[PDB]
């Protein structure tokens, strides 16, 4: 019937003065555009069909053509920035916002989907969708006593579009829009569907990626305990965004990191720092590094949870990026920690893996490791352990690596290695 039409026949049908022929041609276009194998988006655009689809969006007495045109425009807007721009130039944003209030659930869902693609293009189209007033009807669609009564796919699409309205930076979403959206986000964050939870955590991670004031906007709503709970979840698509959000939060002030700590997040890190997924380990070590850069009582809480041995393990064996994050965490620990805490760090066996990592070509990790060693040597000086630590470094082959670093391109590597040799190895 409407299967495998040529764009020529689609154009012929849409250009006819017969609403039913137009509907048939629009469904044929939808079926062309809904195939995985290279949907002919550019051919549909060149045929000048976008204005006709946008006009069909507003045919209230023919809901099927509304639905078909909405689906076609959704799939067109799902492509490159230029194709999304072609959709937007046709005036589709206000038409989709108007359709959000359609009495037909599938049409409003398709409008949500299209607006999600448009906003997900980037900052400019996101803020334009916002300026057209989509947030109010979007949130109204979710204003029900129990989210469970809503259709699953409908709720998932709503959550995804909202997350896209929270996404992207330079600029970040408007403050008032974020405040308007956040309560519904908090509610979605307690929903039971895995996809809704994952997309809500992704939205929260978007919103926490910025100045401490944005992190505060999010943290004030009291979502950190729920974020930790989800950090403990079994579904990787949930743990990943929850961990990203927690990391972004701990990049803020020490009080926000303390809010993360009080929720019990550290107890989850024995598994996260041994998670078989590389990215989970990497981001968990990055979070730990941003935690060890905090106050001394927070370093002490890291110690009490037995996470220093796990940092040693990650530093000993892990993907190289995770090892970079571990080196950064150790350097922050040693720069901000007490003498007792640095001595404990040494007692857990950090020296040997820290030295083994000095043979890597990455110059910045070498600088980081040398800074950590300098801090440890200061802590030892304060106790008179300088010689004992020097002997330990000699026994594991670290002295050879430092002596080799003396003749290194980077000025700071040069100078720091030479200074270590001159000050602690006579």
């Amino acid at each position: 019937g409407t299967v495998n039409w040529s764009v020529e026949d689609i154009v012929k049908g849409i250009n006819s003065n017969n609403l039913e022929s137009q509907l048939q041609a629009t469904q044929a276009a939808r079926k062309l555009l809904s195939r995985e194998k290279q949907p002919p988006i550019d051919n549909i655009i060149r045929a000048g069909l976008i204005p006709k689809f946008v006009s069909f969006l507003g045919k209230t007495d023919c809901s099927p053509i509304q639905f078909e045109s909405a689906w076609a425009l959704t799939n067109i807007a799902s492509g490159t920035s230029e194709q999304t721009k072609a959709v937007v130039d046709g005036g589709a944003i206000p038409a989709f916002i108007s359709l959000l209030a359609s009495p037909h659930a599938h049409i409003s869902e398709q409008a949500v989907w299209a607006l999600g693609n448009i906003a997900g293009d980037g900052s400019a189209f996101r803020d334009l969708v916002i300026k057209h007033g989509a947030i109010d009807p979007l949130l109204a669609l979710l204003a029900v006593p129990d989210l469970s009564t809503l259709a699953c796919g409908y709720l998932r699409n709503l959550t995804w579009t909202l997350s896209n309205l929270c996404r992207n930076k330079n600029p970040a979403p408007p403050l008032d829009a974020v405040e308007q959206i956040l309560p519904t986000l908090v509610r979605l964050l307690h929903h039971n569907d895995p996809e809704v939870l994952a997309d809500s955590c992704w939205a929260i991670s978007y919103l926490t990626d910025g100045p401490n004031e944005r992190i505060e906007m999010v943290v004030k709503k009291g979502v950190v305990p729920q974020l930790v709970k989800l950090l403990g979840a079994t579904e990787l698509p949930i743990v990943t965004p929850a961990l990203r959000a927690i990391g972004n939060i701990v990049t803020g002030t020490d009080e926000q990191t303390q809010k993360v700590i009080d929720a019990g997040a550290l107890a989850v890190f024995p598994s996260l720092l041994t998670n078989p997924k590389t990215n989970i380990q990497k981001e968990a070590t990055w979070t730990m590094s941003n935690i060890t850069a905090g106050r001394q009582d927070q370093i002490q809480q890291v110690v009490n949870h037995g996470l220093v041995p796990f940092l040693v393990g990650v530093l000993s064996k892990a993907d190289f990026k995770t090892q970079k994050e571990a080196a950064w965490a150790i350097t922050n620990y040693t720069s901000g920690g007490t003498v007792e805490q640095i001595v404990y760090l040494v007692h857990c066996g950090i020296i040997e893996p820290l030295m083994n990592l000095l043979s890597a070509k990455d110059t910045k990790i070498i600088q980081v490791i040398l800074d950590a060693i300098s801090n440890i040597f200061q802590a030892a000086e304060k106790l008179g352990e300088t010689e004992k630590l020097s002997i330990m470094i000699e026994e594991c082959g670290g002295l050879d690596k430092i002596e080799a670093l003396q003749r290194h391109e980077n000025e700071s590597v040069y100078k720091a290695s030479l200074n270590l040799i001159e000050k602690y190895f006579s």
């Binding site: 079926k31 555009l33 809904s34 195939r35 995985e36 949907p39 689906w71 959704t74 799939n75 807007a77 799902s78 492509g79 999304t84 398709q110 989907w113 999600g116 693609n117 997900g120 293009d121 980037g122 995804w160 896209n164 996404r167 992704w202």
Partner: peptide, 10 residues
Amino acid sequence: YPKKKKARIE
């Protein structure tokens, strides 16, 4: 990050 956009496929 996850997909910015997604088409409705059938």
